[PDB]
Amino acid sequence: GLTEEQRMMIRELMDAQMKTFDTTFSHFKNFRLPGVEAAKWSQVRKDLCSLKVSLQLRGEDGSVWNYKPPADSGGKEIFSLLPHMADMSTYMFKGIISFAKVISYFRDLPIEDQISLLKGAAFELCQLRFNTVFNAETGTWECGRLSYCLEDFQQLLLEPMLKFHYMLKKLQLHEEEYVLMQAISLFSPDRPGVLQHRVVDQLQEQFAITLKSYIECNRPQPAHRFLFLKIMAMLTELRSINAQHTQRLLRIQDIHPFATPLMQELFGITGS
Ligand SMILES: C[C@]12CC[C@@H]3c4ccc(O)cc4CC[C@H]3[C@@H]1CC[C@@H]2O
Ligand SMILES: O=[S@]1OC[C@@H]2[C@H](CO1)[C@]1(Cl)C(Cl)=C(Cl)[C@@]2(Cl)C1(Cl)Cl
């Protein structure tokens, strides 16, 4: 019951996703691993301990390495996983940039708006991709040979990013709905620096219309009543989480630099 432009739209997005989402993380390589003013620190300590994960690496030979992080004892140990996480986020950002560049609607925008939109949405599309490898039964992001497992329950869901992943996983979305969510986030007309506000706004509306129609054509079950509105509410929450985590990043970076060059570029850090 989709129009022809709507089916072409979904096919282009799925094509871009298929070409640029390394779902086995097979090409994530050469990453770092953990080794073998007072008010600023207290806030950063709170920022860092709100997510605690252990790390598992399954080798191509059947061997397994497992890393359990240190407890916060008031020193530099709270930073032990930052170089690794920076490498992982950098790898994901590259895939997200590649995703956007393949989409015709994005390619046709002026280069300055392309940059503004990626700066605005890269984090959000990364999280949307991460949700598809989230195992809500085990609290684990399954990234091919790497796993990130939440350290232990109802208390963990107080953390907005974690509540987001659990609530979104429960909607049991299709691949097509995830990639439409990515497009709606990417084409947000109100990111800092966008110039072609009206063009971007019209594109976003068409992706939202396509998503609403996809759900109506393919999900008649009473469990999916209001599904379109639930997804849109999650996207608004994701934007909120993005703003929160951007500020966390800049606070951590202020007293303990760790952002890679690509992260600096996307977050506006000039190197001076
Ligand atoms: C998620 C945290 C804030 C956001 C940080 C971030 C934010 C953006 C990004 O590209 C990478 C990282 C790595 C470390 C993250 C932090 C580790 C714990 C903290 O809450
Ligand atoms: O791309 S970044 O690096 C990955 C980290 C975060 C996302 O930012 C979270 Cl929210 C997710 Cl998702 C994963 Cl996976 C981890 Cl491991 C945690 Cl910290 Cl769990």
Q: Mind spelling out the 3-state secondary structure of 8-63?
A: HHHHHHHHHHHHHCCCCCCCCCCCCCCCCCHHHHHHHHHHHHCCCEEEEEECCCCC
Torsion, Cα of 47, 242, 182, 172 (10° steps) = 50
The residue whose CA has the least distance to atom 8 of ligand 2 is: 89
Of the listed ligands, the closest to the CA of 25 is: 2
Decide if 41 contacts 34 (C-beta within 8 A): no
Indicate whether residue 126 lines ligand 2 (CB < 6 A): yes
Indicate whether residue 258 lines ligand 2 (CB < 6 A): no
What CA–CA distance (Å, rounded) separates 13 from 99?
A: 8
What CA–CA distance (Å, rounded) separates 56 from 146?
A: 6
Indicate whether residue 96 lines ligand 1 (CB < 6 A): no
Indicate whether residue 89 lines ligand 2 (CB < 6 A): yes
Burial class (CB in 10 A: 0-12, 13-18, 19+), 185: buried
Residue 146: helix, strand or coil by DSSP?
A: strand
Resolution (in Å) of the shown entry? 2.0
Angle at 123 between CA 121 and CA 128, to 5 degrees: 95
Decide if 70 contacts 58 (C-beta within 8 A): no
Burial class (CB in 10 A: 0-12, 13-18, 19+), 156: middle
Indicate whether residue 125 lines ligand 1 (CB < 6 A): no
Is 186 annotated in some ligand binding site? no
Q: Give 211's contacts (C-beta < 8 A, 6+ positions apart).
A: 177, 180, 181, 184, 228, 231
Q: Give 161's contacts (C-beta < 8 A, 6+ positions apart).
A: 51, 127, 241, 245
Decide if 187 contacts 117 (C-beta within 8 A): yes
Phi first, then psi, for residue 90 (nearest 5°) are -60, -45
Indicate whether residue 124 lines ligand 1 (CB < 6 A): no
Given CA atoms 166, 171, 175, 179 in this order, what sign does their dihedral have? negative
Q: Compute the distance from residue 123 Cα to the ligand 1 centre, in Å.
A: 10
Q: Which of 49, 94, 130, 238 to mutate to test the pocket of ligand 2 (most atoms within 8 A of CB)?
A: 130
Burial class (CB in 10 A: 0-12, 13-18, 19+), 66: exposed
Q: How many helices (H) and strands (E) does the chain have?
A: 10, 5
Q: Give 86's contacts (C-beta < 8 A, 6+ positions apart).
A: 32, 258, 259, 260, 263
Residue 127: what residue type? Q
What CA–CA distance (Å, rounded) separates 238 from 49?
A: 20
Atom of ligand 1 nearest to the CA of 90: 10
Query: Per residue in 74-86, is it b (16+ CB within 10 Å) or e — as a string?
Result: eeeebeebbbbbb
The residue whose CA has the least distance to atom 7 of ligand 1 is: 249
Given CA atoms 194, 196, 200, 202 in this order, what sign does their dihedral have? positive
What CA–CA distance (Å, rounded) separates 214 from 212?
A: 6
What CA–CA distance (Å, rounded) separates 41 from 251?
A: 9
Decide if 181 contacts 232 (C-beta within 8 A): no
Give break positions in the chain: residue before each, C–N beyond 2.5 Å: 36, 152
DSSP code of residue 221: S
Q: Which of 82, 78, 8 is nearest to 43 (CA)?
A: 78
Residue 225: helix, strand or coil by DSSP?
A: coil
Task: Map tokens 């997804």 to a residue.
Answer: 231
